[PDB]
C-alpha cells in the first residue's frame, strides 16, 4: 500500500510529498498518517545535513549567454534610437518599444540560467531548493544569476533603463537607488494588507457567523 | 440650538 | 471614587453628569416652591432637559465638558454602550485569560507533532493550582497555603516539585497561539514536554499552519481547565488531528523547507 | 479539516469567512473602488475587486448587460454607438459611449444579462436580468477570478456560504401580515407563505422580489439586535429593537458570545448537548430499579 | 573555580591602581592552567599578593608542594602605584564545563 | 519629538541623534497621508538613505540621513556632487539643492576614471530622476561617492552590493540592536567606517595632543602631553545605559607611552581596537542540521560558551519609596515582620541590601513597613495574634523584592533621606532607595543573533563540541547556518563574507571591502588560493596526505561538477577550496558529509532582549477595577489577550467549553474564577461558569439608558443573571 | 463647584492660600516651599496645613481621561481591585475555615466557643466573656485548652504553616 | 437555574424605573473628605445602593454569614460582598419631565 | 497521534458527539470514584515513575481507552437523567 501511493519515478518535490500525505490520509488512516509525517520529517532532516548543500558565491552560476542576450538587445536598443533620431517613432512609441525589448530580453536570460543548470549542473545548490518544493522563486533566482531588470519610478511609470546587474555581481550605486523606489511601494503594500487582511475577515464573519 | 443665547434673549 | 496617589481620586465621568441632573432637578423644586417667575422656571427646565440628555447621550445636542482641563465629552451612557471603543464594541477585541502565558519560540526537531516543548518555569505558574493539590497528595507539602509559600521563592523548590508538575501534566495538553490568528489552525493543542530555559519548543511541520518563522515570533499558551475543555482540546483541537486545511483538501502538514530539500 | 463528510455542528460560517480573509493579504491593494479617473481605466484587480464583489457595487467600468434575450444590431453615427437587442416581440436600445469596447457583433443571440460591454458587471443588474441563480453564480466565480489569478486555491464552498447571506433578504410587493415595502429574510417569508397556504387557509400569496445587498448591509441589518448593536450604530439598532420589544432568540455565535453563553455551534450542539454514558454494570443496575417497581 | 580579592565584594568592581577590572581578571584566570600530581589534591587554594609598580604574572603565586603552574608568564594584571592586590584563587579537579552559576563556591 | 536616547550600543545612540521624522508639530505631516511620502523619492539621493527606514506601519516616514548629507543654511538636504567641466572631472564639490540637481546632467561614480578624464564614450548619467546613457561631453556633474547614497548605519554592511535592499534594511536595523559584549571583536571583513563610527560616536577615548602616559589605572589614564601638561582621564567604569547595556572604557595603552594625537587611550563599550565591534567573528559551516536550523533557527557549538564569547553584562535599576500614609509613615528598616532571618542575610545594612550580594527572584532587595488596614484593625486577625503573640507589629510587609525573571549582584545603591542636599523629592515621597543590579548574560537557546546582512535567527540548540561538524584538521565549526534562508532572501553578501573570511582565517588577516568598490570575486579566489597553502601546505609537511573520506567526497564532487575530472586530489581540493567550500566530517559519525560544504569567518552580533522577552507566565493575579479582566504590572505577569481572530479559531473548532472558559473562568466570571481556583486546589473538576461580569456590566450600562434588558426562560418568563443582588431591599 | 463638597470656610481658606502664593510668586522666582505660605498666611499656618489644603484644592481627575499617547486609553483598566479575593484568597478562606472548623469542634464548648465567638463572631473582656462562671474558670480553660489545642496542632502540623 | 435562551430589549416604564431602584438619590453629595464614607442620601448612600464591606454592615450590629439574608434594625444593610454595591440601582425623581435624546434625535 | 482516533471517530454518528461522550465519562470516572472502570485487570492504563497510572493520572485517557472497547453505551436518551447518579453512588465506593 506504500508503493501504490508513491511515485519513485521522480525527485520528491513538495508536491509529490503533499500528494503522498493526502493519499496516505485517505487510504491508511489519520494517525497512521501522522507517523509517516514524522518519519519524513526525521529522514528529511537527517539526509539534509549529510547532503552538504550550502550556499556559496560561485554556486549562483551566471550563464555564458547573459553577455549575448544583453549585447544583442543592446544594439537593438541602438536601432530604436536611430529610428527615433529620424522622427519615425512617436515619443511614446520609442518608450513602449524599449520596455518591450527588455521585458523579453529579461525573460530570455531567465530561461537561460535554468537551462544552464538543467543541462550542466543538475545538482546546483541554489537550484535544487527551487525545483524541490523547498525554497526559491523563479523570479528570485533571476536576480542572483540572471539580472533584475526593470524597476518602476515613484508613480508607476517604469523606468526607461534597466538594472543591468545581478546580485552575484555588484548591483551598482544607482541601479540600486533606481531599484530602491519599487522597494518602498512593496513594503508599503505589506504593512497595509496586514490590517486589510483583518478588514476582509471582519466583514465576512459579521454576515457569516450564524 | 445652543443654550446660553436662548435664555439670554429669553429674559433680556 | 478611588484613592490614587498622595491623595488623587478617580471617578467614572458619569458622576459629574449625575450631579448635573440632581442639582438642576433640586434647584427646580426649590424654584417652584420659592415662588415662580416664568422665564426662570423654563430657563431651568431647559437646563434640566439638556442635563437629562447628557447622562443618556452626550453630543447629540451639544457636548458637556469637565471644567477647564480636558475639553472632553464626559462619557455618556450611550458613549458607554457604543463609544470609540466601548461596551459591545470592545466586548469583542478581547479579554485577558487567567491561565495564559507567552514566550519566544524555537524549533523542536525531535519533537513529534503530538507534543510541544514548554518551559517548566512557565508550566509551574500556569499549572500552579493543579500542582498545589498534587503537592498535598504527596509528602512535599502538608497543605495548599503551605505548598504556596513553598513555591513563593525560586531557591526553595525541592526537585520533588518538578516530579509533581511532570506528573500533573501527564496527559493534559495546552493550546498555542500565533500573532495573526488567521484561520482555526491559528491555535493548536499539543502535549507539553517540560524543558529547561526560556524558549518554547515548537514542531517544524506545524510551522506552516501558524505563519511562524524563528526570528523572534512569540507564541502565547493557554490551558484547558474543564475536563470537557480538555476533552475537546485534545480530541478535536490537538495539532496531530488537524492535518488537512479547511480551505483546500490539500495537506498543511506538508514537509516544509528543510525536509523536502533533504528528501 | 478531516476528509470525510462534514460533521454536524461545525462552525462553517467562520471556517469560511477565514479561508477567504487570509489569502486576501496576498492580493494587491491600490484603491478599493479600483482604478483612477483617467482616460480609460477599464477593470479592477486584487483585493479592491474582492471588496467591490462582496459589497455589491457599481464598478467604474460597468458593462451594460442585456435585459432582453434576442438578436444584435449596431449603428455608425459619429458621437455615440448603440447596440440593439430584439426578438420577434421587442427590441431594446442600449447607449454605448465612446470608451465602451463591444464584445458582441451584428448578428447573434445574447441571453439575458449577458455581457454587451467589456468588463465588470453590477450584481444588482445581473440579479434583475438573469436571476439570483445568476448573480450568485457570477459573484462566486468572479471572486475566485482574483484568487486563482494570485495562486490561492480556496474551495468555492466558502464563497458561496458568504454570497448566500447577501441574499437572505428580499423585498415585498404583495402583503399579508406586514405592509409591502419592507426588506426581510427570504426563509422567514417561506415560513409565512408555507403556513398561510397550507395549514391556515386563504391563499394570501406573499409576493416578493429577490434582493441583493452587500455583505456589509446584510449583516448591518439582521434579526438579532445584539449582533447589530455590535457594529453599525448601537444607538439606532437598540432604539428600534426596544420600541418593538424584540426577543433575540440566540442562535449565531456573535450574539451568544456577548452573553458569555455556550456557543450555539460546536459542542454546544442541541444534537449532542445531551448524551449519556453507561457501563453494562450500571445498565443491569437501573433495570433492577425497574424490577423493584413490581408492588407486593 | 573561585576567587577572592580582599577589598572587592562583587564581580563587577574595579580595583584602584589596577588597570584591569575584576571581570577581565577573573577571565584571565580561566586561562590559567595548573597541574597537581595526586588525588590527595582535590581543591587547592593558590595565594598571591603583590603591591605597587609591578606586573602580576601567574609565577607570582606562592608555590604549593604538590602543585605546579604550567602558565607562569600569563598576564593577570598591571599595577600602577599604591596598587594593592591580595587574592585567593581556588582550583579544582573536575570534568567538562560547569557554569559559575551551577556550582556557586 | 524628543525621546529616550537609544544607547544599546554607541552606534545606536548616534543614529537616534541624527534620525529625521515626519510626524510631529501636526502642521507638517500627520498620520493620514502616507504612500506618496513614504516612497523613496528621486531626490532622496545622498540626502536620505533608501534602506535605513524602519520596517513597520511607520515606514519611510521616520528615517536617518545619509553619509555626506548636510543641512546648509535652511533645512534643505543638499547632496554633494563634484563638477565635471567638459570631459574633465574635478575634485571640487557643490552641495546642490534638490531643485537645481534637475537642471543638470549628473553621472555616477562607477565611471572609469583616469583622473580628470572620463574613460568611456557611452557612460551612464541620470538627468532628472531618469536613467540616461550620456556622452563624456555632456557629463556636467558627477556623484561624489558610493557612501553618500546611504546612511552611516547602512554604510557598515560589507558587500551591500550583493544584498537585496529589502533584507539589508534588516541588517541596518539589526546593528542598532547590538548589545556590547565584554569581548568585542571587529569583523573579519569591514566596509571602512567602523573606525569613524566609534570615533564620531563617543565610545572610545582619544588623545588630544602628543605626549607620554603617566598612570594607567583601571579607573584613569593620566597622560602627559609634551606641552608640559598632564590631565587625568576618568573612565566610565561600569555605567548603566538607558536600555541596560554596560558602558566601560577599557584602557589599551601601557605605562609610559608616547601617544600620537588622536589615538585610542581606552576602547569604548564595544570596540576592540578603535574599531566598531559588536558580536564576534566566528567560524561557520553553512549547511542543514537535523531540524535545529529549520526556518530560521541557529545551531551553536557549546564551545562558544566555554570561551566567554557571546556574553554580555546587564543592569536593571529597582527603586522603592517610603511613602507617607495617614495611617502612619512607611518605615524602611531591616525589620520584615512575619517569618525569617534567612531572608534577612543579604539585608545586611539595616534596611538596604549589601553590595555584591547575589539576589535571586524572590529575595528582599529593600525592606519597608506600611500599615495593615485602611482605617480599622481586624476582629478575626485580632484573635489569632492574641493566641500566639498578641503583641505583634501591626505593620505590613511592603518590601521591594526581586521580580520574577532575574537579578544579579548588587553593584551600587542610593538612599535619599530627610535633609536633602540639592535633590528634588516629590510630595508625599519621604525618601527614595535605588538599587543597581548587574548580571552576566551568557549565550543561550532563547537568544537571537544576526549578521549585518539580515540573516536573523534564534539559537535552537547548543551542541557539544563532541559531535558538531568538524574540519579535517580537528578545528570544529562554531555555528551551523541553514542554506535555505539564503535563496528566498536575496543577500549573497553574507555568502561572500564567509568566503573572504575563510581566507582570513588561515591567512590570519582582516580586510576592508568598501561598499560597492570593495573586493572582487577574482581577488577573493586569489586569497583563498593563498589560504590553501596555509591549510594544506602544513598538512603536507606535518606528515600526511589525503583521507579515504577526502577522496570519497571528491568522487561525489566530480559527479556533481565542482572539480575538473582527471586532476590530482591535491589539485582538485585547491579548486574545490577556491570555490569557498571544503570537506567536512560529521563529528557524530566521523564519516564525511557527502559534497563540499562552505565554511568561514562570519561576523555575528547578539541582539538585545526586550522586557517582553522575559517570558510571561501567569497563574492568577490582579484584576482591573472597572473592567474585571486580568491585569499585571510589577510582579504578577498579567494575562495574554484572547482576541477575536483567536476566538474564531476556537469557534471553528468544536471547542465549546474551551471557549466559554476563556470568556468565563479565565477572565471575567468573578464568581467563576474564584470557585475555579478553589476547585482546582481540591482536585475537583472546575465549576460550570457563572454569568460574566462583562454581561452584567453591559445590562446595567444598558439599564443606565432607558432600555430594559431582561433575560428569559424556556417559556417567555424571567431568569436571573444578577444572582440575588437586584431584587429589592 | 467641586465633586467632593467643601464648606465655605475651606473655600475662602483656599482663596487666601492661593492669593498668598501669588504674592509669594511675585519676587522669589521660586514657587514657595510650603514654608512661606504658612508665614505669609498668618497665626496658625504650618507646612502640614498648606500641603493638606492644596491637596484638597486639586479637583479630582477624570477616571475617564485620554491616556498614554491619546489614541484610545481610558484611565481605568490599570487600577487594581482590593476587596475582591484574588483566587489565592478564596483558597485561603477555604482551608483556613475548614481547618479552624475542625479544631473548633474537637474542643470543650465552655471557654473555646466563648473566645471563638467573642473573638470571631461579634467584636474582639475576660469577665464579660463567660456566661455565669467567673474569670478563674475562664483563664483556666482558655489558657489550658488553647495550649492543648496548640501543642497537638504542633504534633500534627496543619496550622504551623501560617495561613498568614 | 434554567438556561437563558432569549434576551429582549423593551422600553422602560417609569414604574419599572422605580421597580429596579432602591431609594432616591436626592442630593449631590458624593463623599465627604473627613470620612471617605458616603455623605448624605447622595449618589453613594448605603441604603440606596448597599453595604461597602464583605459580609459586615456599616455600623456592625450583625457581622457574619449566619444571618446573611436579613437587614439591620436601626440601619439598612442586607449582605453578600460589595458586589451588591455594584449591581444595585437607584433613581432620581425628575421634577418636570424631559425626554430621552436617544429617541428624540 | 492519539490511540485509534479513527476507530473512535467511526463509532460515533457525529465527531462532536465523541468529544461529549469521552468528557462526560471522564467526569463520572473521577466523581463516583476512579475505580468506575470496565477494563482494569491485565492490560490497562499506565504511567512510568512507577507503574502508578493505575490510580489517578488522566481521566479521559481512560474514557477513550474504554470507549475504544465495546463495553460502554452512549445514547441520546439511554437511562433516565436523575436515577443514574443515584444508582451509581450506590454501587461505586471510594468517595
Ligand atoms: C513563494 C515562496 O518561495 O515562499 C515565500 C516564503 N514562504 C516566505 O519567505 P521569507 O520572507 O520568510 O524569506 C514568506 C513568508 O514568511 O510567509 C514571505 S515572502 C513570500 O510571500 C514570497 N511570495 O516570496 C513567501 O512567504
Ligand atoms: Mg518571523
Ligand atoms: Mg520566514
Ligand atoms: Zn447597621
Amino acid at each position: 500500500v506504500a508503493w501504490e501511493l508513491i511515485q519513485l519515478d521522480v525527485p520528491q518535490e513538495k508536491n509529490s510529498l503533499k500528494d503522498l500525505v493526502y493519499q496516505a490520509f485517505l487510504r491508511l488512516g489519520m494517525e497512521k498518517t501522522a507517523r509517516l509525517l514524522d518519519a519524513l520529517k526525521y529522514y528529511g532532516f537527517t539526509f539534509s545535513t549529510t547532503s552538504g548543500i550550502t550556499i556559496g558565491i560561485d554556486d549562483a552560476v551566471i550563464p555564458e549567454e547573459k553577455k549575448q542576450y544583453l549585447e544583442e538587445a543592446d544594439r537593438k536598443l541602438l536601432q530604436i534610437e536611430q529610428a527615433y533620431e529620424m522622427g519615425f517613432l512617436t515619443d511614446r512609441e520609442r518608450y513602449d518599444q524599449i520596455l518591450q525589448l527588455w521585458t523579453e530580453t529579461t525573460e530570455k536570460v531567465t530561461q537561460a540560467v535554468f537551462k544552464n543548470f538543467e543541462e550542466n549542473y543538475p545538482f546546483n545548490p541554489l537550484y535544487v531548493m527551487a525545483q524541490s518544493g523547498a525554497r526559491g522563486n523563479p523570479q528570485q533566482i533571476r536576480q542572483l544569476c540572471g539580472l533584475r531588470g526593470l524597476m518602476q519610478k515613484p508613480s508607476g511609470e517604469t523606468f526607461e533603463v534597466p538594472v543591468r546587474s545581478s546580485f552575484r555581481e555588484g548591483l551598482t550605486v544607482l541601479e540600486y537607488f533606481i531599484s530602491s523606489h519599487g522597494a518602498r511601494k512593496g513594503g508599503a503594500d505589506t504593512a497595509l494588507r496586514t490590517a486589510d487582511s483583518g478588514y476582509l475577515t471582519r466583514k465576512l464573519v459579521d454576515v457569516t457567523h450564524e | 440650538k445652543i443654550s446660553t443665547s436662548d435664555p439670554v434673549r429669553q429674559y433680556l | 471614587m478611588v484613592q490614587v496617589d498622595g491623595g488623587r481620586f478617580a471617578t467614572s465621568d458619569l458622576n459629574d453628569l449625575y450631579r448635573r441632573l440632581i442639582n438642576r432637578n433640586n434647584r427646580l423644586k426649590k424654584l417652584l416652591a420659592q415662588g415662580a417667575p416664568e422665564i426662570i422656571i423654563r430657563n431651568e427646565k431647559r437646563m434640566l432637559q439638556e442635563a437629562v440628555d447628557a447622562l443618556l447621550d452626550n453630543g447629540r445636542r451639544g457636548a458637556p465638558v469637565t471644567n477647564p482641563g480636558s475639553d472632553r465629552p464626559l462619557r455618556s451612557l450611550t458613549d458607554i454602550l457604543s463609544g470609540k471603543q466601548g461596551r459591545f464594541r470592545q466586548n469583542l477585541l478581547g479579554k485577558r485569560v487567567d491561565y495564559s502565558g507567552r514566550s519566544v519560540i524555537v524549533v523542536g526537531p525531535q519533537l513529534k507533532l503530538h507534543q510541544c516543548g514548554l518551559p517548566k518555569r512557565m508550566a509551574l505558574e500556569l499549572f500552579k493550582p493543579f500542582l498545589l493539590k498534587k503537592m498535598e497528595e504527596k509528602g512535599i507539602a502538608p497543605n495548599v497555603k503551605a505548598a504556596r509559600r513553598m513555591l513563593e521563592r525560586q531557591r526553595d523548590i525541592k526537585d520533588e516539585v518538578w516530579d509533581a508538575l511532570e506528573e500533573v501534566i501527564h496527559g493534559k495538553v495546552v493550546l498555542l497561539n500565533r500573532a495573526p490568528t488567521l484561520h482555526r489552525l491559528g491555535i493548536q493543542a499539543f502535549q507539553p514536554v517540560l524543558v529547561e530555559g526560556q524558549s518554547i519548543q515548537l514542531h517544524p511541520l506545524v510551522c506552516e499552519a501558524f505563519n511562524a518563522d524563528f526570528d523572534g515570533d512569540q507564541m502565547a499558551v493557554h490551558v484547558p481547565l474543564s475536563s470537557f475543555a480538555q476533552a475537546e482540546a485534545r480530541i478535536q483541537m490537538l495539532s496531530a488531528h488537524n492535518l488537512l486545511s479547511p480551505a483546500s483538501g490539500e495537506p498543511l502538514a506538508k514537509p516544509s523547507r528543510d525536509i523536502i530539500l533533504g528528501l | 479539516s478531516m476528509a470525510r463528510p462534514v460533521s454536524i455542528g461545525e462552525a462553517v460560517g467562520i471556517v469560511a469567512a477565514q479561508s477567504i480573509g487570509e489569502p486576501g493579504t496576498q492580493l494587491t491593494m491600490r484603491t478599493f473602488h479600483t482604478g483612477g479617473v483617467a482616460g480609460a481605466a477599464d477593470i479592477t484587480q486584487g483585493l479592491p475587486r474582492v471588496i467591490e464583489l462582496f459589497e455589491a457595487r457599481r464598478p467604474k467600468a460597468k458593462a451594460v448587460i442585456s435585459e432582453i434575450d434576442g438578436v444584435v444590431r449596431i449603428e455608425e453615427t459619429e458621437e455615440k454607438l448603440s447596440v440593439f437587442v430584439e426578438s420577434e416581440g421587442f427590441s431594446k436600445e442600449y447607449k454605448l459611449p465612446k470608451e465602451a469596447r463591444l464584445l458582441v457583433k451584428d448578428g447573434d443571440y445574447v441571453e439575458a444579462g449577458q455581457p454587451l460591454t467589456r468588463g465588470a458587471i453590477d450584481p444588482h443588474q445581473l440579479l434583475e436580468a438573469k436571476g439570483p441563480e445568476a448573480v450568485e453564480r457570477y459573484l462566486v466565480e468572479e471572486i475566485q477570478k482574483v484568487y486563482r489569478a494570485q495562486g490561492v486555491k480556496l474551495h468555492d464552498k466558502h464563497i458561496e456560504i458568504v454570497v448566500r447571506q447577501m441574499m437572505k433578504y428580499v423585498e415585498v410587493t404583495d402583503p399579508g401580515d406586514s405592509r409591502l415595502l419592507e426588506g426581510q429574510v427570504l426563509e422567514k417569508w417561506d415560513v409565512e407563505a408555507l403556513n398561510e397556504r397550507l395549514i391556515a387557509e386563504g391563499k394570501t400569496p406573499v409576493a416578493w422580489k429577490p434582493l441583493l445587498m452587500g455583505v456589509t448591509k446584510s449583516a448591518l441589518s439582521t434579526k438579532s439586535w445584539l449582533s447589530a448593536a455590535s457594529f453599525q450604530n448601537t444607538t439606532h439598532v437598540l432604539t428600534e429593537a426596544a420600541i418593538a420589544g424584540k426577543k433575540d432568540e440566540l442562535i449565531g455565535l456573535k450574539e451568544n458570545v456577548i452573553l458569555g453563553r455556550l456557543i450555539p455551534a460546536g459542542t454546544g450542539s442541541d444534537f449532542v448537548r445531551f448524551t449519556q454514558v453507561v457501563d453494562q454494570k450500571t445498565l443491569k443496575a437501573i433495570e433492577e430499579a425497574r424490577k423493584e417497581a413490581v408492588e407486593a | 573555580t573561585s576567587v577572592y580579592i580582599e577589598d572587592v565584594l562583587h564581580e563587577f568592581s574595579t580595583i584602584p591602581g589596577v588597570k584591569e577590572d575584576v571581570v577581565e581578571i577573573i577571565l584571565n584566570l580561566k586561562e590559567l592552567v595548573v597541574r597537581f600530581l595526586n588525588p590527595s589534591l582535590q581543591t587547592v587554594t593558590l595565594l598571591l599578593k603583590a603591591e605597587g609598580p609591578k606586573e602580576v604574572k601567574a609565577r607570582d603565586f606562592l608555590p604549593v608542594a604538590d602543585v605546579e603552574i604550567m602558565n607562569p608568564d600569563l598576564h593577570i594584571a598591571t599595577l600602577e602605584e599604591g596598587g594593592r592586590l591580595n587574592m585567593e584563587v581556588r582550583v579544582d579537579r573536575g570534568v567538562g564545563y560547569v557554569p559559575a552559576e551551577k556550582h556557586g563556591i | 519629538l524628543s525621546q529616550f536616547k537609544d544607547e544599546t550600543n554607541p552606534l545606536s545612540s548616534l543614529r537616534h541623534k541624527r534620525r529625521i521624522s515626519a510626524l510631529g508639530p501636526g502642521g507638517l505631516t500627520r498620520e493620514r497621508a502616507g504612500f506618496d511620502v513614504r516612497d523613496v523619492h528621486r531626490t532622496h539621493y545622498g540626502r536620505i538613505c533608501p534602506v535605513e527606514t524602519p520596517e513597520g506601519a511607520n515606514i519611510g516616514l521616520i528615517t536617518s540621513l545619509a553619509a555626506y548629507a548636510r543641512v546648509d543654511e535652511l533645512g534643505f538636504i543638499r547632496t554633494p556632487y563634484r563638477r565635471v567641466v567638459g570631459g574633465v572631472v574635478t575634485d571640487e564639490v557643490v552641495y546642490m539643492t534638490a531643485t537645481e540637481e534637475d537642471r543638470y546632467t549628473i553621472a555616477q561614480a562607477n565611471t572609469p576614471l583616469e583622473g580628470n578624464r572620463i574613460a568611456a564614450e557611452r557612460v551612464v548619467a541620470r538627468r532628472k530622476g531618469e536613467p540616461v546613457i550620456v556622452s563624456p561631453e555632456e557629463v556636467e556633474f558627477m556623484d561624489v561617492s558610493p557612501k553618500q547614497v546611504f546612511s552611516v548605519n547602512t554604510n557598515l554592511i560589507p558587500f551591500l552590493e550583493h544584498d537585496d535592499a529589502n533584507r539589508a534594511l534588516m541588517g541596518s536595523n539589526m546593528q542598532t540592536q547590538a548589545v556590547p559584549l565584554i569581548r568585542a571583536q571587529a569583523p573579519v571583513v569591514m566596509t571602512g567606517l567602523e573606525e569613524r563610527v566609534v570615533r564620531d560616536s563617543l565610545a572610545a577615548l582619544y588623545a588630544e595632543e602628543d605626549g607620554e602616559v603617566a598612570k594607567v589605572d583601571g579607573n584613569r589614564i593620566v597622560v602627559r602631553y609634551e606641552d608640559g601638561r598632564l590631565v587625568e582621564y576618568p573612565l566610565r567604569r561600569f555605567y548603566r545605559s538607558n536600555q541596560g547595556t554596560a558602558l566601560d572604557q577599557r584602557p589599551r595603552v601601557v605605562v609610559g607611552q608616547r601617544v600620537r594625537k588622536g589615538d585610542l587611550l581606552a576602547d569604548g563599550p564595544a570596540s576592540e581596537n578603535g574599531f566598531l565591534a559588536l558580536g564576534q567573528n566566528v567560524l561557520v559551516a553553512i549547511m542543514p542540521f537535523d531540524g535545529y536550523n529549520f526556518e530560521d533557527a541557529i545551531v551553536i557549538s557549546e564551545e562558544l560558551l566555554k570561551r566567554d564569547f557571546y556574553t554580555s553584562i546587564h543592569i536593571e535599576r529597582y527603586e522603592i519609596e517610603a511613602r507617607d500614609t495617614k495611617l502612619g509613615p512607611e518605615r524602611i528598616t531591616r525589620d520584615i515582620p512575619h517569618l525569617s532571618e534567612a531572608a534577612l542575610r543579604d539585608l545586611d545594612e539595616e534596611g538596604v541590601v549589601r553590595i555584591g550580594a547575589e539576589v535571586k527572584p524572590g529575595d528582599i532587595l529593600v525592606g519597608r513597613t506600611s500599615f495593615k488596614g485602611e482605617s480599622e484593625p481586624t476582629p478575626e486577625e485580632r484573635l489569632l495574634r492574641s493566641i500566639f503573640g498578641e503583641k505583634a507589629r501591626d505593620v505590613k510587609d511592603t518590601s521591594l523584592r526581586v521580580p520574577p525573571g532575574e537579578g544579579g549582584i548588587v553593584v551600587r545603591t542610593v538612599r535619599l533621606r530627610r535633609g536633602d542636599p540639592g535633590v528634588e523629592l516629590k510630595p508625599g515621597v519621604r525618601e527614595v532607595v535605588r538599587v543597581y543590579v548587574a548580571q552576566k548574560r551568557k549565550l543561550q537557546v532563547g537568544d537571537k543573533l544576526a549578521n549585518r546582512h539580515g540573516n536573523k535567527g534564534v539559537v535552537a540548540k547548543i551542541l557539544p563540541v563532541e559531535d558538531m561538524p568538524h574540519l579535517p584538521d580537528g578545528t570544529p565549526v562554531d555555528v551551523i547556518l541553514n542554506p535555505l534562508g539564503v535563496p528566498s532572501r536575496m543577500n549573497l553578501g553574507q555568502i561572500l563574507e564567509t568566503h573572504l573570511g575563510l581566507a582570513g582565517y588561515f591567512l590570519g588577516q582582516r580586510y576592508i571591502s568598501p561598499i560597492f568598490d570593495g573586493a572582487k570575486e577574482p581577488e577573493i579566489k586569489e586569497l583563498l588560493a593563498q589560504a590553501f597553502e596555509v591549510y594544506f601546505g602544513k598538512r603536507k609537511g606535518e606528515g600526511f596526505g589525503v583521507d579515504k573520506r577526502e577522496v570519497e567526497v571528491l568522487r561525489r564532487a566530480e559527479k556533481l561538477g565542482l572539480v575538473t575530472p582527471g586532476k590530482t586530489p591535491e589539485e582538485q581540493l585547491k579548486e574545490l577550496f577556491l570555490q569557498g567550500k571544503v570537506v567536512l566530517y560529521d563529528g557524530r559519525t566521523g564519516e564525511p558529509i557527502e559534497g563540499p560544504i562552505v565554511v568561514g569567518q562570519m561576523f555575528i552580533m547578539k541582539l538585545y532582549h526586550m522586557v517582553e522577552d522575559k517570558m510571561h507566565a501567569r497563574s492568577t493575579g490582579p484584576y482591573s477595577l472597572i473592567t474585571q479582566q486580568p491585569l499585571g504590572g510589577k510582579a504578577q505577569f498579567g494575562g495574554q489577550r484572547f482576541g477575536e481572530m483567536e476566538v474564531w479559531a476556537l469557534e471553528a473548532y468544536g471547542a465549546a467549553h474551551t471557549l466559554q472558559e476563556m470568556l468565563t473562568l479565565k477572565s471575567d466570571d468573578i464568581e467563576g474564577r474564584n470557585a475555579a481556583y478553589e476547585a482546582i486546589i481540591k482536585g475537583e473538576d472546575v465549576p460550570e461558569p457563572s454569568v460574566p461580569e462583562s454581561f452584567r456590566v453591559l445590562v446595567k450600562e444598558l439599564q443606565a439608558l432607558a432600555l430594559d434588558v431582561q433575560t428569559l426562560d424556556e417559556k417567555d418568563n424571567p431568569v436571573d443573571i444578577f444572582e440575588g443582588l437586584a431584587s429589592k431591599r | 463647584a467641586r465633586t467632593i463638597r467643601i464648606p465655605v470656610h475651606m473655600v475662602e481658606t483656599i482663596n487666601k492660600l492661593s492669593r498668598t502664593a501669588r504674592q509669594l510668586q511675585q519676587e522669589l522666582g521660586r514657587e514657595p516651599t510650603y514654608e512661606e505660605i504658612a508665614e505669609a498666611m498668618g497665626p496658625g499656618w504650618d507646612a502640614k496645613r498648606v500641603e493638606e489644603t492644596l491637596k484638597i484644592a486639586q479637583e479630582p481627575v477624570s477616571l475617564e481621561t485620554p491616556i498614554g499617547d491619546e489614541k484610545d486609553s481610558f484611565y481605568g483598566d490599570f487600577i487594581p481591585d482590593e476587596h475582591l479575593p484574588s483566587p489565592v484568597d478564596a483558597a485561603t478562606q477555604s482551608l483556613l475555615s475548614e481547618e479552624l472548623e475542625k479544631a473548633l469542634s474537637k474542643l470543650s464548648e465552655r471557654e473555646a466557643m466563648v473566645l471563638k465567638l467573642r473573638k470571631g463572631l461579634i467584636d474582639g473582656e475576660e469577665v464579660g466573656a463567660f456566661f455565669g462562671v467567673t474569670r478563674e474558670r475562664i483563664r483556666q480553660i482558655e489558657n489550658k485548652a488553647l495550649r492543648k489545642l496548640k501543642y497537638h496542632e504542633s504534633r500534627t502540623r496543619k496550622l504551623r504553616d501560617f495561613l498568614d | 437555574k434554567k438556561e437563558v435562551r432569549k434576551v429582549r430589549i423593551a422600553l422602560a416604564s417609569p414604574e419599572k424605573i422605580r421597580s429596579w431602584s432602591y431609594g432616591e438619590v436626592e442630593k449631590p453629595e458624593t463623599i465627604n473628605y473627613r470620612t471617605l464614607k458616603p455623605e448624605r442620601d447622595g449618589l453613594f448612600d448605603e441604603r440606596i445602593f448597599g453595604p461597602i464591606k464583605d459580609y459586615e454592615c456599616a455600623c456592625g450590629k450583625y457581622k457574619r454569614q449566619r444571618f446573611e439574608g436579613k437587614v439591620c434594625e436601626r440601619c439598612g444593610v442586607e449582605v453578600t460582598k460589595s458586589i451588591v454595591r455594584r449591581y444595585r440601582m437607584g433613581h432620581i425623581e425628575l421634577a418636570t419631565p424631559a425626554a430621552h435624546i436617544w429617541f428624540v434625535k | 497521534a492519539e490511540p485509534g482516533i479513527d476507530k473512535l471517530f467511526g463509532m460515533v454518528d457525529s465527531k462532536y458527539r465523541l468529544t461529549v461522550v469521552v468528557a462526560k465519562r471522564a467526569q463520572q470516572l473521577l466523581r463516583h470514584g476512579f475505580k468506575n472502570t470496565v477494563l482494569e485487570p491485565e492490560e490497562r492504563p499506565k504511567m512510568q515513575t512507577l507503574e502508578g497510572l493505575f490510580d489517578d493520572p488522566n481521566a479521559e485517557t481512560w474514557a477513550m481507552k474504554e470507549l475504544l472497547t465495546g463495553r460502554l453505551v452512549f445514547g441520546e436518551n439511554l437511562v433516565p437523567e436523575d436515577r443514574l447518579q443515584k444508582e451509581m453512588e450506590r454501587i461505586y465506593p471510594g468517595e
Side-chain angles (χ1 to χ4, degrees), chain A residues 14 133-137 140, chain C residues 208 211-213 215 257, chain D residues 26, chain F residues 166-167 170 295-296 484-485 487-490:
Chain A
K14 77 180 183 185
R135 261 241 198 229
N137 257 293
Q140 268 161 30
Chain C
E208 264 37 46
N211 192 275
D213 335 84
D215 44 296
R257 312 217 150 306
Chain D
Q26 277 168 270
Chain F
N166 149 57
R167 236 79 176 184
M170 319 192 105
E295 233 254 0
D296 268 340
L484 304 196
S488 40
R489 291 132 214 166
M490 290 160 299

Side-chain angles (χ1 to χ4, degrees), chain A residues 28-32 34-35, chain I residues 1-6 9:
Chain A
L28 342 170
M30 195 179 286
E31 44 183 359
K32 289 227 169 71
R35 250 221 285 306
Chain I
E2 301 290 37
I5 165 73
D6 326 314
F9 267 146

Side-chain angles (χ1 to χ4, degrees), chain G residues 70-89:
Chain G
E70 270 92 1
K71 316 190 182 308
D72 55 298
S73 188
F74 251 168
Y75 215 21
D77 163 63
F78 308 152
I79 293 175
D81 75 71
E82 33 288 332
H83 303 155
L84 318 182
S86 81
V88 203
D89 311 16

Side-chain angles (χ1 to χ4, degrees), chain H residues 57-61 72 75:
Chain H
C57 153
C59 75
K61 239 271 182 278
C72 191
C75 95

Side-chain angles (χ1 to χ4, degrees), chain C residues 178 212-217:
Chain C
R178 229 313 282 252
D213 335 84
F214 297 135
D215 44 296
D217 324 84

